[PDB]
Amino acid sequence: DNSYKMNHKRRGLCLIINNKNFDRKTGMKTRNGTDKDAENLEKTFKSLGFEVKVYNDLTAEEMQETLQEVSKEDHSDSDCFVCVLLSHGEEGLVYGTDGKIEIQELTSLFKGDKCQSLVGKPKLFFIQACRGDELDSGV
Amino acid sequence: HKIPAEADFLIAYSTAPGYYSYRNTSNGSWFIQSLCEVLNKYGSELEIMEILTRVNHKVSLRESSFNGKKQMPCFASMLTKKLYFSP
């Protein structure tokens, strides 16, 4: 009642969305260095037991469809689910290659009443993206 | 009986609400690089909140190059139990 059951048949899926190159209409710069992030995450989460799948340069529509497909996959024998988003963003929003999508449009795909095989299981999202225009000058 | 539909989510952001997040073109992003460093050293030992607190620590002590700036990661937890990546 106090710790998640983490001894299922498999740890579960780690899904990495790695957006580096953006359409010209977005005006967003190329995210040089993000391929090193994706590769580090792959080795790291694989050593923790996860199966790992990387997607690169997805449109906003492709991000929603990919995560929707994952929310319909067979998680019953898994401990948990991990999603990593690497992109540009603003508060509450992340960039596809062609434009923005709300983070809640992605996370809501995995809520209890929509993804039954993950009910009661940890759903972890790691989000590398800006959340606004404010600068922290420190102390 | 029932559990909330939003139960058992954890969102770990690279930065605090409203703020920039930094990415180095040769090393990768400050947040992901520290996240992997901590996971690689302690991922099979510590509870997830403890891991993410150390990530907060490491990034906060990392400084940019818009020069001389800092970053504070922020994680939001709707988890209901302790989470270990048991080997």
């Binding site: 992109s87 963003g89 590398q128 800006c130 | 997040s21 180095n24 190059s65």
Partner: peptide
């Protein structure tokens, strides 16, 4: 360093 760059921003996202």
């Amino acid at each position: 360093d760059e921003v996202d």
